[PDB]
Amino acid sequence: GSACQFWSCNSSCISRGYRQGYCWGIQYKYCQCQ
């Protein structure tokens, strides 16, 4: 079970206007998009 499952970031990026989203490899308070 990941510390950040990409689907939650993915839906959070697409709702802003992107097509993809995920967390970084180590340290994060916010997602990465496209």
Sign of the torsion angle spanned by Cα atoms 9, 13, 16, 14: negative
> How far apart are the C-alpha atoms of 33 and 31, rounded to whole Å?
7
Q: In total, how many domains does the chain have? A: 1
The tokens 């939650």 sit on which residue? 8
The last residues before gaps in the chain (C-N over 2.5 Å) are none
> How far apart are the C-alpha atoms of 19 and 33, rounded to whole Å?
8
Give the up-direction half-sphere exposure of residue 26: CA atoms within 13 A in the CB hemisphere: 0
Structural domain including 15 reads 1-34
Instruction: Please give the DSSP secondary-structure letter assigned to residue 3.
Output: S
